[PDB]
Design a protein around this ligand. Structure first.
Ligand SMILES: Nc1nc2c(ncn2[C@H]2CC[C@@H](COP(=O)(O)OP(=O)(O)OP(=O)(O)O)O2)c(=O)[nH]1
Ligand SMILES: [Mg+2]
Ligand SMILES: [Mg+2]
Ligand SMILES: [Mg+2]
Lengths: 105, 662
DNA sequence: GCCAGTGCCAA
DNA sequence: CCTTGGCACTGGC
């Protein structure tokens, strides 16, 4: 139930979505990214209705990340109507993401 | 004989004050110090030695002390001081001849650690005295609380500077006696510290005379400088930079940016298991972050065509499969491989040519304007580049050139070579009286090393090659025979071959394979089979292990052989180097005895010496015609001097600049 | 700034 | 086994 983004689809799918979108900027070569991946797969089911989980691989899609000043991965950016509502870097746990989402939702 | 040294406020280019000097006299066996107000007395002492037909010893005096004293005597005392060349000795020149196999810091200009091999002790200390003095000066001031500025240790005289001056002469005296104790250069029967100048040159090995004369002439050449066109090169820089900006724009358009791990300190460990994963990027577990939540710190990196890693990355991501690699763990990414790289995407395939162009663009930009030794950074107020020359920098007896290297200017037939070469010219110097541009005379020795080969193999073929070699131009005759595109390619081919290049190497030179390599090698070696006999005799003479490590040079010196396979190159490159060295000395001497004066306030001026070629500035075209004729006479003289078995010749060219005179 | 690796520029 | 040399540029400590 994840929306796999591209550079070209990002503007519409994220910045014009009108709702809550959690974008995960990741890379296949990152250790922490592989850790938080399965956690995201579950948050998408639980938060299906009040939030949408999206993923953008910085290798296949190199144009989006620089615009948000990415200095570390995985970068979890919570978008709310084309605006960055909250940013969190690192492989959080199921509980830490749950908190973060509920608090910012 | 006296040993001396001076301390002044700056390098020769801008020196305006004599601080102190020291003189050690062998006849009294005492040291005498001279402070700033004793300048006149110091100068008198040096002339007194000259008046006795004696000798004055300095360590780097030819390039610094001697000219410095002439400049300072006129500025401070309004006196004409001119020590004759024949009364001067330079321990640095002597050390570079005797210890030709070793490197040196070029009087502290070069990083001591970047130099290979060992360094002679006394000379090492002499080359470090200035930096060592700066260290003593800096700490003495920080003890008193005072602050150190730029290079204030040389602004004024002090007793600490005086002490280092006395130490210089004691060390120079020690180095001198260590050099004179070499029985190969100085006969044991003679006490060279107790003879007049005339006896010093006549009794010592011929090489000792040639080296001092070469160093004295080349010091003058440095002071002359090479008239440079700053405006033309600044305009060339704008053109190159504009092309670089465009190449970079298109290249970054085709090859996008990416992220890479950077800054990670912590080891990433398997969550499930626990074993450290050394292949994964280093992480960072914080104290926008959450304590305990790991993350890979990353950097954004833009494509850089000047990197060989980025090109390799991008081209392999496009399908390129590297054939040749480097002994470390990196594919070879040079112009050879780039020219042969084949991908699928037409845009990326086209980008490879932009990369090849960019690399050359950068090569020209770095040498002309941006590099640390760039021409634009080296032009003095007189509108000239005073490149340095180590008269005996190469083991073979060749000279080395640096700051900047005027012996590596791009050739007129290479991209932007005509513009680069045209910027160096006598035309760029306007006469001090008439304001009219000078004329240039470039002379180059014809087929130098091949004629040296003809000489040495004459005992084997009875001068057959020496006769055949002058049947038209050798390089044009070889070019056609070998079916080569250019005469320059024939030169690189013939020397590559002569000096033991493998089949594949000979193939690379000519633009073919190992097959063509073997053909060309045996084709030329069968024509002149005396090459094999010459190589073998060299081996029987040098190798048994080592029977003898050095080769006896044309002037008697020891020429250190580094490797058995480069022994023919040592023999031939040394012969050409010594021939050319005696050639430039004789040329100037003949011009001088013809009434011509050396200097910008005279008739001619040496601007550059690039192995077997000289570029001389001439006040008039008439003078340039004579310099060219005199150089031909001096070469024929050199050949007869050493009884060469092959006639030596030169080719002269008159013109406004280097693009036209070479 | 030092340094290792790579490459090009000239003779 | 091309040789002799200077020097630019990336990327690691
Ligand atoms: N090992 C080696 N030596 C070379 C090479 N090119 C030049 N040399 C040496 C031998 C000749 C000497 C001077 O170079 P030149 O280009 O003047 O050669 P040359 O043979 O005298 O030719 P010319 O008649 O054109 O002046 O430097 C080369 O590629 N390899
Ligand atoms: Mg000195
Ligand atoms: Mg020549
Ligand atoms: Mg030449």
């Amino acid at each position: 139930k994840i929306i796999h983004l591209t550079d070209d689809s990002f503007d519409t799918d994220v910045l014009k979505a009108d709702g809550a979108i959690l974008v995960d900027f990741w890379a296949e070569w990152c250790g922490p990214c592989k850790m938080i991946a399965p956690i995201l797969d579950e948050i998408a089911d639980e938060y299906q209705g009040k939030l949408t989980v999206a993923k953008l691989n910085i290798d296949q899609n190199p144009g989006t990340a620089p615009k948000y000043g990415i200095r570390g991965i995985p970068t979890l950016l919570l978008f709310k109507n084309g605006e960055v509502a909250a940013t969190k870097v690192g492989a959080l746990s199921k509980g830490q993401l749950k908190e973060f989402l509920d608090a910012n939702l | 004989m006296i040993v001396s040294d001076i301390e002044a406020n700056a390098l020769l280019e801008s020196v305006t004050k004599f601080h102190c000097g020291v003189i050690y006299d062998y006849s009294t066996a005492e040291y005498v110090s001279y402070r700033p107000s004793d300048f006149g007395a110091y100068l008198d002492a040096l002339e007194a030695e000259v008046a006795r037909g004696g000798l004055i010893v300095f360590h780097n005096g030819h390039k610094y002390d001697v000219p410095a004293l002439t400049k300072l005597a006129k500025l401070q005392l309004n006196r004409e001081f001119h020590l004759p060349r024949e009364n001067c000795i330079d321990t640095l020149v002597l050390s570079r001849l005797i210890h030709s196999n070793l490197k040196d810091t070029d009087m502290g200009l070069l990083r001591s650690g970047k130099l290979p091999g060992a360094l002679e002790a006394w000379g090492y200390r002499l080359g470090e005295m200035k930096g060592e003095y700066k260290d003593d000066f800096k700490r003495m001031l920080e003890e008193q609380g005072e602050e150190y500025v730029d290079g204030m240790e040389w602004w004024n005289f002090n007793e600490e500077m005086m002490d280092y001056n006395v130490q210089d002469v004691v060390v120079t005296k020690a180095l001198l006696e260590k050099l004179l104790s070499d029985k190969h250069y100085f006969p044991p029967e003679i006490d060279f510290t107790d003879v007049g100048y005339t006896t010093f040159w006549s009794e010592s090995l011929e090489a000792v005379d040639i080296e001092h004369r070469a160093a004295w002439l080349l010091a003058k050449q440095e002071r002359n400088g090479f008239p440079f066109d700053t405006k033309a090169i600044e305009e060339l820089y704008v053109e190159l930079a504009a092309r670089r900006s465009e190449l970079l724009r298109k290249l970054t358009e085709t090859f996008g940016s990416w992220y890479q791990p950077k800054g990670g300190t912590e080891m990433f460990c398997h969550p499930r298991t626990g074993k450290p994963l050394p292949k994964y990027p280093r992480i960072k577990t914080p104290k926008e972050y959450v304590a305990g939540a790991p993350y890979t710190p990353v950097e954004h990196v833009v494509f850089n065509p000047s990197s060989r890693d980025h090109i390799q990355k991008k081209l392999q991501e496009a399908g390129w499969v590297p054939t040749k690699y480097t002994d470390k763990g990196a594919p070879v990414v040079d112009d050879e491989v780039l020219e042969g790289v084949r991908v699928d995407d037409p845009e990326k395939q086209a980008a490879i040519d932009l990369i090849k162009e960019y690399l050359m663009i950068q090569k020209r930009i770095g040498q002309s304007a941006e590099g640390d030794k760039a021409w634009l950074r080296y032009v003095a107020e007189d509108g000239k580049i005073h490149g340095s020359v180590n008269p005996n920098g190469a083991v073979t007896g060749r000279a080395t050139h640096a700051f900047p290297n005027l012996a590596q200017i791009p050739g007129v037939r290479s991209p932007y070579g005509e513009q680069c070469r045209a910027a160096f010219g006598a035309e760029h110097h306007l006469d001090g009286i008439t304001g009219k541009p000078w004329v240039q005379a470039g002379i180059d020795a014809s087929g130098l090393e091949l004629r040296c080969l003809a000489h040495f193999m004459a005992r084997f073929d009875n001068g057959e090659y020496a006769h055949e070699i002058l049947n038209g131009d050798i390089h044009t005759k070889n070019q056609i025979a070998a079916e080569l595109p250019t005469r320059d390619n024939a030169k690189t081919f013939i020397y590559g071959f002569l000096y033991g290049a493998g089949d594949e190497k000979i193939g690379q030179i000519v633009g073919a394979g190992k097959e063509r390599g073997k053909e060309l090698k045996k084709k030329f070696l069968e024509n002149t089979p005396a090459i094999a006999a010459l190589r073998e005799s060299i081996q029987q003479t040098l190798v048994e292990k080592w029977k003898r490590r050095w080769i006896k040079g044309l002037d008697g010196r020891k020429v250190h052989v580094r490797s058995p396979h480069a022994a023919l190159n040592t023999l031939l490159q040394s012969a050409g180097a010594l021939i050319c060295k005696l050639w430039i000395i004789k040329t100037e001497e003949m011009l001088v005895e013809k009434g011509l004066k050396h200097g910008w306030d005279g008739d001619f001026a040496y601007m550059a010496w690039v192995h077997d070629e000289i570029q001389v500035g001439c006040r008039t075209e008439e003078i340039a015609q004579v310099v060219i004729e005199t150089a031909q006479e001096a070469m024929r003289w050199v050949g007869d001097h050493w009884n060469f078995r092959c006639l030596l010749d030169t080719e002269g060219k008159m013109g406004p600049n280097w693009a036209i005179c070479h």
